[PDB]
Write a protein that binds this ligand. Structure first.
Ligand SMILES: [Cu+2]
Ligand SMILES: [Cu+2]
Ligand SMILES: [Cu+2]
Ligand SMILES: [Cu+2]
Length: 505
């Protein structure tokens, strides 16, 4: 296997605006097929990248900054990864649309899966309205990220390399003196399988495919043989002996990570998907499913000279392998201090979400289910509805709902709602067999409130097997057509995604 920790961690450059005034910031980002070396010992890999980079440029904005991004497709007319033509029913082969994950965004700038476009916008999907997306950024400071969201192609376009970081800085948070600038570093984690010739491998069918299966065929899960951070295989990062802030993003298709430091050191979590936690949390490990973000401080002050592995204990399709996927990256505490560490790790960070006292307008019960298709493949469904079925999740703008998510399946699903961030209320285990036979919900234990890591704002949430997860969301400030879905991309594409209409009655 590839030798670990021989390439330095890339830190994507921050994107520069094409035009900027006090009133408007304007960016242009063009999707390009390019080649990049992913490891010292590999030939360059053909990838799809925003501005031809993998990951894409980091975009940094201020809270309330009036931002526009013209996302453009300049990709080849043929994909290089295997397309399954049976999962969606003349359209172009390569369709793209950019979604700002976590963005409080008007609906026509949200990257609806059917708002896709081909090269130069030559062909556009039925929900396409505009070329230049508008991000008003009227939301809490947080780690966001942007990625492709095209109908029935999301798992492929994201795997190809179409992911990047987007950070909203709220100037009100500056007084906290959290590690900043060079000491504030995004970590986009993506698992990949790479052929000897350097080319990406993505499966064209399940292992030992039934003769009944189409070719190519979608698979329900992808587990990569190798882990990359910021577009390099098992990299090292030279750090100063001081406090760093890391914006940890799971940009993988399926894989969940459970992260720790191999010297037994602690993380201090300061933020979740939706921004700063009300109080900092000391953690020895944390779970990170697709699309979740952790905003953490690691304090290297006492560890000068040491090499510390960011390790992983979560399996993907089996037990973790000590020599491969148990490793994410390596910190080397060998960079001389550039200046005094004047950063802080404060306990008191932000207002509790619980200060809010919104009236519960609706309690929405939702189930994670699915069926089997004519080929014998599993089709994962929210409420046993297809993406194309008439909309059923129709919250009213400005109102608050409790969503009760029932998971009788064998696995976790990282459920994501567009537009909003939400509070986690509790998780409660239930009798799966009884639910499957009668549809009746019989609890097998008391409700468990969220751990401190989940006492802030979330937008992607692990709904574990055999549990009912309750979340509370206020639907706004915008009305329009959004979505909600499982963020395991293999599930999302077939067919665990539903429209979500926020109505203005
Ligand atoms: Cu996303
Ligand atoms: Cu999203
Ligand atoms: Cu799923
Ligand atoms: Cu989405």
């Amino acid at each position: 296997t590839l030798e670990k920790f021989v390439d330095a961690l890339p830190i994507p450059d921050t994107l520069k605006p094409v035009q900027q005034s006090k009133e408007k910031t304007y960016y242009e980002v063009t999707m390009e097929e390019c080649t990049h070396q992913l490891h010292r010992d590999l030939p360059p890999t053909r990838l799809w990248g925003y501005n031809g980079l993998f990951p894409g440029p980091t975009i940094e904005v201020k809270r309330n900054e009036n931002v526009y991004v013209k996302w453009m497709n300049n990709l080849p007319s043929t994909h290089f990864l295997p397309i399954d033509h049976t999962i969606h029913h003349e359209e172009p082969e390569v369709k793209t649309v950019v979604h700002l994950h976590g963005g409080v965004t008007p609906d026509d700038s949200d990257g609806y899966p059917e708002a896709w476009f081909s090269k130069d916008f030559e062909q556009t999907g039925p929900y396409f309205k505009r070329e230049v997306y508008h991000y008003p950024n009227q939301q809490r400071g947080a780690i966001l990220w942007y990625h492709d969201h095209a109908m029935a192609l999301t798992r492929l376009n994201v795997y190809a390399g179409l992911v990047g970081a987007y950070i909203i800085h709220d100037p009100k948070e500056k007084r906290l003196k959290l590690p900043s600038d060079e000491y504030d570093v995004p970590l986009l984690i993506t698992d990949r399988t790479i052929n000897e010739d350097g080319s990406l491998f993505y499966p064209s069918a399940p292992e030992n495919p039934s003769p009944s299966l189409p070719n190519p065929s979608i698979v329900p899960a992808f587990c990569g043989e190798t882990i990359l951070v910021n577009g390099k295989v098992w990299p090292y990062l030279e750090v100063e002996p001081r406090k760093y802030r890391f914006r940890v993003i799971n940009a993988s298709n399926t894989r969940t990570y459970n992260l720790s430091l191999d010297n037994g050191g602690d993380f201090i979590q300061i933020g979740s998907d939706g921004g700063l936690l009300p109080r900092s949390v000391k953690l020895n490990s944390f779970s990170l499913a697709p699309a979740e973000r952790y905003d953490i401080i690691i304090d290297f002050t006492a560890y000068e000279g040491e090499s510390i592995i960011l390790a992983n204990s979560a399996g993907c399709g089996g037990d973790v392998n000590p020599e491969t996927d148990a490793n994410i990256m390596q910190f080397r505490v060998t960079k001389p201090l550039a200046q005094k560490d004047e950063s802080r790790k404060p306990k008191y960070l932000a207002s509790y979400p619980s200060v809010q006292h919104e009236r519960i307008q609706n309690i929405r019960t939702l189930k994670l289910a699915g069926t089997q298709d004519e080929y014998g493949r599993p089709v994962l469904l929210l409420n046993n509805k297809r993406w194309h079925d008439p909309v059923t999740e129709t919250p009213k703008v400005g109102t608050t709902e409790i969503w009760s998510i029932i998971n009788p399946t064998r696995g976790t699903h990282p459920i994501h709602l567009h537009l909003v961030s939400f509070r986690v209320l509790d998780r409660r285990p239930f009798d799966i067999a009884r639910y499957q036979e009668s549809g009746e919900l019989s609890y097998t234990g008391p409700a468990v409130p969220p751990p401190p890591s989940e006492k802030g704002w979330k937008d992607t949430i692990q709904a574990h097997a055999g549990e009912v997860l309750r979340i509370a969301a206020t639907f706004g400030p915008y009305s329009g057509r959004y979505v909600w879905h499982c963020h395991a991309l293999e599930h999302e594409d077939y067919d665990m995604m539903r429209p979500m209409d926020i109505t203005d009655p």
